[PDB]
Amino acid sequence: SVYDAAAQLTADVKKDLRDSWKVIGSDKKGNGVALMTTLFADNQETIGYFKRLGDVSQGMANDKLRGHSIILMYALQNFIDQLDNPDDLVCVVEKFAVNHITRKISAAEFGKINGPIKKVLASKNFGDKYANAWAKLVAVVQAAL
C-alpha cells in the first residue's frame, strides 16, 4: 500500500533523490523531453496511450509533447518537495494517481519509466545508486495505481 511504500524512502534515499534532482531538475524542458523520447524509443508499445500528442518522433518540435514533458517535470519537482512530510507526499501521490488510473495505466506500465530515468541519470554521471533511489520513489506511485 502507498503508506508502506512511502516508508521505504529512508534518509539516504531522500538525500540521493535531492542531490540528483538538483542537476536533472535544472533543465526541465530538455530532460523532460529526453525522458519521454527514451520511453517511446525503448518501449514503443506505450505510444498508444499518447495518441493526443500527435507525432511523437518530432521530440522538441512537437508543441504538445514539449508541453507534456515540461508538466511531467513539475510533478517530479512536487514529489521531491514533499519528501520532508510523508503525509503530504502520500496525498499528492494519490491525487496524481487518479488520472493515471482513469487511463488504465497499471503499476507495471508505470514502472516502464524506470529505464528512461536510469538513462537520463547516466547521461549526467549519476550511476546505479541514484537509479535505485528513483526506482523507490516510482514504487510509491506504483503502489497507488
Query: Applying CB under 8 A, which residues contact a second copy?
Result: 28-29, 52, 63-64, 66-68, 70-71, 74-75, 77-78, 81-82, 87-88, 90-92, 94-96, 98-99
Cα-Cα-Cα-Cα dihedral sign, residues 18, 19, 20, 25: positive
Report the partner that residue 131 touches, choosing among a second copy, ligand HEM, none (CB closer than 5 to 8 A by kind): none
Residue whose CB is nearest to ligand HEM in the complex, by number? 99
> Please, what is the minimum distance in Å from the beta carbon of residue 24 to ligand HEM?
11
Cα-Cα-Cα-Cα dihedral sign, residues 114, 43, 50, 99: negative
Q: Where along the sequence are the contacts to ligand HEM (CB under 6 A)? A: 46, 49-50, 52-53, 68, 71-72, 75-76, 95, 98-100, 103, 105, 109-110, 112-113
Distance CA 145, CA 139 (A): 10
Helices 128-142, 114-123: inter-axial angle, 10-degree rounding: 150
Q: Which residues are annotated as a binding site for heme b?
A: 100
CB-wise, 103 or 125, nearer to ligand HEM?
Answer: 103
CB 6 within 8 A of CB 86: yes
> Please, what is the minimum distance in Å from the beta carbon of residue 82 to a second copy?
7
Q: How far is CA 129 from the centre of its chain?
A: 17
